[PDB]
Amino acid sequence: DPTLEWFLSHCHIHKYPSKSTLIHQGEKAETLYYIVKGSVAVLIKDEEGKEMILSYLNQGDFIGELGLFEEGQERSAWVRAKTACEVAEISYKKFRQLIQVNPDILMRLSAQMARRLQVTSEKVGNLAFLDVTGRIAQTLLNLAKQPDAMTHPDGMQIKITRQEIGQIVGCSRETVGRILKMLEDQNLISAHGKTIVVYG
Amino acid sequence: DPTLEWFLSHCHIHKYPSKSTLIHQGEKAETLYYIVKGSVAVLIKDEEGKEMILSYLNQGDFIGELGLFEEGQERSAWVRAKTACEVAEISYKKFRQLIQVNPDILMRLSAQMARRLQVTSEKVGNLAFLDVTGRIAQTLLNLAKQPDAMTHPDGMQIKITRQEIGQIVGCSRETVGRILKMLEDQNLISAHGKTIVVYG
DNA sequence: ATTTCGAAAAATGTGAT
DNA sequence: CTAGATCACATTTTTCGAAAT
DNA sequence: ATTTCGAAAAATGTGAT
DNA sequence: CTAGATCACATTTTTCGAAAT
Ligand SMILES: Nc1ncnc2c1ncn2[C@@H]1O[C@@H]2COP(=O)(O)O[C@H]2[C@H]1O
Ligand SMILES: Nc1ncnc2c1ncn2[C@@H]1O[C@@H]2COP(=O)(O)O[C@H]2[C@H]1O
Numbered sequence: 001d002p003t004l005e006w007f008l009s010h011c012h013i014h015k016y017p018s019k020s021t022l023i024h025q026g027e028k029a030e031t032l033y034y035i036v037k038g039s040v041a042v043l044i045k046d047e048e049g050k051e052m053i054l055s056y057l058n059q060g061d062f063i064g065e066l067g068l069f070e071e072g073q074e075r076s077a078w079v080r081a082k083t084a085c086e087v088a089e090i091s092y093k094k095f096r097q098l099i100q101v102n103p104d105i106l107m108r109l110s111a112q113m114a115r116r117l118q119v120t121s122e123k124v125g126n127l128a129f130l131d132v133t134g135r136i137a138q139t140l141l142n143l144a145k146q147p148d149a150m151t152h153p154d155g156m157q158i159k160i161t162r163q164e165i166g167q168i169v170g171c172s173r174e175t176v177g178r179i180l181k182m183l184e185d186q187n188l189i190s191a192h193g194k195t196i197v198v199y200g
Numbered sequence: 201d202p203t204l205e206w207f208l209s210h211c212h213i214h215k216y217p218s219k220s221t222l223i224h225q226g227e228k229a230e231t232l233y234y235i236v237k238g239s240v241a242v243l244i245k246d247e248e249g250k251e252m253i254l255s256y257l258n259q260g261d262f263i264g265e266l267g268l269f270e271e272g273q274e275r276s277a278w279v280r281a282k283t284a285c286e287v288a289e290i291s292y293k294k295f296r297q298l299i300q301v302n303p304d305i306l307m308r309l310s311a312q313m314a315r316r317l318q319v320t321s322e323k324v325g326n327l328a329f330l331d332v333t334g335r336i337a338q339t340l341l342n343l344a345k346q347p348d349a350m351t352h353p354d355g356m357q358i359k360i361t362r363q364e365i366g367q368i369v370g371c372s373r374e375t376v377g378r379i380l381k382m383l384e385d386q387n388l389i390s391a392h393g394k395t396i397v398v399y400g
Numbered sequence: 401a402t403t404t405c406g407a408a409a410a411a412t413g414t415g416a417t
Numbered sequence: 418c419t420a421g422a423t424c425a426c427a428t429t430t431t432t433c434g435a436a437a438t
Numbered sequence: 439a440t441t442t443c444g445a446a447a448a449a450t451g452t453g454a455t
Numbered sequence: 456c457t458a459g460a461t462c463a464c465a466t467t468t469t470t471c472g473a474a475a476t
Contacts (some may be wrong), residue, residue, distance in 0.1 A: 028430055036298030044321070046329040054321055066318055069311035076318050111269035113313045118266050118276045120320045121244070121254055126368040127327045129246035130420070161411060161431095170328035177329065177413065193430055194411085300445085331458070361469095363449065372460055377450065393468060 005103055008096060013087035017083045020062070025081040029067025032095050035059055038085030039148060043167070044077045053168045054120065056082060057117065058147055063111050068092045080147070127170060135169040136179050140189060144198040154190070155200040203304050210298055211242070211288035216281050222263060223279035229267025232295050236258050238285025239348060243367075244277045253368045255319065256282070260349050262309050268292050283348070327370065333379050335369035340389065343368075344398045354390070355400035362394075 011034065013104045016022055022033065022040060033083060039058040043051050057063060067073040087091045090098075099106045126135050143149065144156040151157065162176035169176070211234060216222055222233060222240060239258045243251050245354075248294075254277060257263060267273045299306040326335055343349065344356035351357070362376040369376075383389045390397035 044325050046325070050329065050385060052325060052328045054210055054324060066314045069307075069314045076321060099303060099307070103299070106306060107269070107299075109314065110306065110310045113310065113317060114266045114269045117313060117317050120317065121276060122357060124320060125244050125252060125329065127324065128252045129250065152246060164410065170219060173411080174413075174423080175421060178421095184325060188410095190353070331460095333458095361449065373450075374452085374461085375459060377452095381451090 003104055004034075004108065006102075006151050007059045008088050008099065010094060011090045014087050014089055016087060018081055018084050018086045020081050021078065022081060022085070022087065023075050023077070025076065026074050027132055029064060029073045029075050030092050031064060032068055032090055032092055033063035033079075034088040035061050035063065036086045036088050038080040039081050040079050040085060040089075042077050042079050051167050052170055053164070054123075055116070056146060063087075063125060067111060068095065070131070074077070075083050128167045132169060132171045132175060133179055135171070136165060136176060137183065137188075139165060139168050140183075140196065142199050152197050154200050157195065160196065161194055203302065204308065205297065206302070207305050208234070208288055210275050210294060211290045213286065213288045216285040216287055218281055218284050219276060220288060221280045222285070223275045223277070225275050227275050227280045229264055229273055230292055232265055232268055232290050232292055233263035234263050234288040234290075235272055236264065236286040236288050238287070239282045239346075240279050240285060241282055242277050242279050252370060253364070255316065255321070256346055262312055263287070265309055265313065268295070313348050332369060332371045332375055333382075335371070336365060336376060336379050337383075339365060339368050340396070340398050352397045355398040357395065357397045 013036065016038075029141050033151060035058060037059050039056060039061065040054055042054045042055060042063075045051050057079075063079055110147065123183050130138065140158075143158050143160060146158075148168065149156050161173075162180060163173045165180075166173045166176045180189070180196070183189050186192050188199060190199070213236065216238070223229075225244065237259055239256060240263065241256050242254045242263075244249050244254060251291060257279075259294065263279055265272050266276050298378065305361075326338055330338065343358050343360060346358070349356055349358045362380065363373050366373045366376045380391055390399070
């Protein structure tokens with residue numbers, strides 16, 4: 001569309017290879033990102049290094065907006081590329097110039113925040129009310145909805161490690177493993193290595 | 201300030217008593233609120249009633265905005281009022297227009313969304329990385345930031361039932377007290393009935 | 401591109417406490 | 418009372434860098 | 439109307455499980 | 456294991472509406 005086009009025009013495009021880091025938690029925030037292609041992972045670490053995945057973002061999604069609204073803000077999390085990415089970049093200052101000449105570009109970003117908030121609040125509840133099995137069940141169902149999910153004859157097929165699932169639901173990798181085995185005993189999913197098919 | 205004044209102008213200001221709910225999770229959202237005076241608690245419930253305080257929102261905060269950007273959306277959580285509230289209302293439709301002739305108001309809202317994202321995100325970290333003690337600890341510091349909080353000569357002072365805290369960190373009324381005492385013991389806080397002083 | 405190949409790096413199951 | 422977290426490695430699985438089609 | 443007062447509800451302190 | 460949730464009570468704080476002011 002005419003807007004998310006005149007926008008990329010004022011953006012410096014960059015390419016990150018898979019697994020590379022795009023945003024270091026704690027660093028000064030002054031740049032704003034928009035994913036033209038590929039997908040990233042937004043995660044936070046603890047003093048020990050343990051990682052918790054807050055979300056996956058993809059083509060169309062903005063990154064690093066949380067710093068644009070006030071001076072003195074440091075990145076709130078790490079953002080590591082899930083796949084090779086093509087990322088549009090622009091400075092906050094160079095961006096507020098744009099809001100003042102078509103705030104629609106702002107509504108689009110804002111909508112995306114509104115969503116992230118809802119979604120992240122959702123996770124808070126999951127963590128607070130559901131046991132691990134529920135959270136894992138829930139995550140598999142979500143993961144199956146992500147765009148990087150392939151379609152399988154018996155449902156939707158996905159690739160993820162127990163380690164990673166454990167970093168989404170916040171439980172150990174061992175536990176994920178046992179739970180995965182029980183969901184299969186109940187013919188809910190067929191687990192084979194990193195390939196997990198979620199039955200329709 | 202100037203703008204926020206202009207905004208209120210088009211808002212059908214109202215009055216809400218304490219314990220009264222402003223938003224019902226699940227209903228169609230078509231209204232945007234603004235707390236002129238008072239304070240509210242945004243909260244969510246489990247399948248059987250349990251509550252989780254996502255956040256306290258005071259004066260100057262907007263309410264029911266996640267419904268503003270997309271269509272056919274439902275309120276994402278319950279919003280009850282702590283003290284008595286003076287809440288400015290306004291329809292999304294009329295609001296959207298207000299933005300048209302001055303995107304600065306939309307900026308303000310978005311700024312508030314951004315901080316709510318960070319905070320909710322940091323809440324996820326806490327729930328996944330910390331044990332109750334750490335959670336209760338962390339909440340205490342935070343509660344000692346809300347406007348309804350007085351200033352003590354040692355740190356700060358607030359009023360909150362052990363029940364509430366149990367609902368903000370996500371643990372039982374018991375655990376909250378047990379760990380609370382341990383806190384007094386290890387001389388780090390000052391408690392008594394429903395009053396607390398955090399040492400800084 | 402993606403297919404194949406042989407390391408080399410990562411992810412796993414274990415199961416009593 | 419009780420969901421899960423732990424712990425160290427031998428054993429799997431997957432990823433990786435180069436040669437091929 | 440505002441305040442004062444003594445049941446109820448709400449909130450706790452516990453130790454065991 | 457081992458933080459925490461539960462359970463079943465006795466014992467305080469607060470909450471509130473009626474009654475005094
Ligand atoms: N809860 C979340 N959901 C989605 N994206 C997030 C979340 N928390 C942080 N991020 C993204 O990660 C970025 C980290 O740096 P910023 O704070 O600049 O901006 C943040 C967002 O782009
Ligand atoms: N995690 C949160 N942090 C802060 N405010 C929130 C959060 N979740 C919901 N809200 C507010 O609660 C409102 C509930 O209804 P809406 O979804 O219309 O808009 C929501 C926000 O204004």
